[PDB]
Paper text:
G111V was only reported for a 31 year old male, with no family history of HCM. The ABD was in the ‘closed’ conformation in all the structures, as found for other structures of the ABDs for the second striated muscle isoform ACTN3, and the two non-muscle isoforms ACTN1. However, although continuous densities are observed for the loop region at residues 110–120 in both the WT and the A119T mutant structure, this region is disordered for G111V mutant between residues 112 and 117. For both the WT and A119T mutant structure, Val112 is orientated towards the interior of the molecule packing the side chain into a hydrophobic region. For the G111V mutant, the mutant residue Val111 now occupies this same hydrophobic region and thus reorients Val112 and the subsequent residues away from the molecule resulting in a more flexible conformer for this loop region. This larger alteration to the structure for G111V may help to explain the decreased thermal stability for this mutation observed by circular dichroism. The G111V mutation had the greatest effect on stability with its melting temperature (Tm=56.8°C) being 5.5°C lower than that for WT (62.3°C). G111V is just outside of one of these regions, and although this mutation appears to introduce some instability into the subsequent loop containing this binding region, it may not have a large effect on actin binding affinity. The Kd was increased ∼2-fold for the A119T mutant, and ∼1.2-fold for the G111V mutant constructs compared with the WT ABD. After photoactivation of a small region of mEos2-tagged ACTN, we found that the rate of fluorescence decay from the central region of the ‘photoswitched’ area was reduced for both G111V and A119T mutants compared with WT ACTN2, and this change was significant for G111V.
α-Actinin-2 (ACTN2) is the only muscle isoform of α-actinin expressed in cardiac muscle. All four isoforms of α-actinin consist of an N-terminal actin binding domain (ABD) comprising two calponin homology (CH) domains, connected via a flexible linker, which allows for conformational flexibility in the ABDs, to a rod domain. Thus ACTN2 is important in cross-linking actin and titin filaments in the Z-disc. We have investigated the effects of two mutations identified from HCM patients, A119T and G111V, on the secondary and tertiary structure of a purified actin binding domain (ABD) of ACTN2 by circular dichroism and X-ray crystallography, and show small but distinct changes for both mutations.
Residue numbers in the entry: 35 to 257
Amino acid sequence: AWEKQQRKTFTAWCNSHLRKAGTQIENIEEDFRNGLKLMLLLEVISGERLPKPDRGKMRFHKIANVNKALDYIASKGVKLVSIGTEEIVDGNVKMTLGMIWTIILRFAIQDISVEETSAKEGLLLWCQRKTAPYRNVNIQNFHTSWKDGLGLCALIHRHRPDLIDYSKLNKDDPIGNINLAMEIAEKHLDIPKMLDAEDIVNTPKPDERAIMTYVSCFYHAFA
């Protein structure tokens, strides 16, 4: 169930940046094979210029573009262990997801710094701080603590109490709470809906990379 969740969230996330450059992806397992939109994604999120892309359709042109992407990422202190150009070009689902996770981590999460605490840990602390007043919320992690929708509704309410009546909410309708939160964030905070509520609720432990990805948008939307 983790691939399904990551596929939705990572794609939605990539799309939240690609739109700023006039394009989208649809199918993440194929839409980065040629390197073109992968390079473009890196430009948008970094604000840096990558080398000019190769629009040739053969494998060798794709390898060149993907290497422009991966070399750039490695220039930003990202150690690529088992992510390989050939398999991105050829189309490996797992590795594509992992590569996009690595970019999300580096560019959406790594630089989050809260009370001398950075990255995942720093994002976690910010969440805990913003949700401390909410007795029906207990953020310990980026999976089970977000399952019931209240964490997300609390982050919204904390910054924008005008968008949500939090006191009406409870644990009884986790699918509704998540959708509510995603609807408000989409409509008012310019954060596309990146989670499938159904997947999140119906799994003992939802995917933490996906959850982190989405929660990082709230962090950036508010700061």
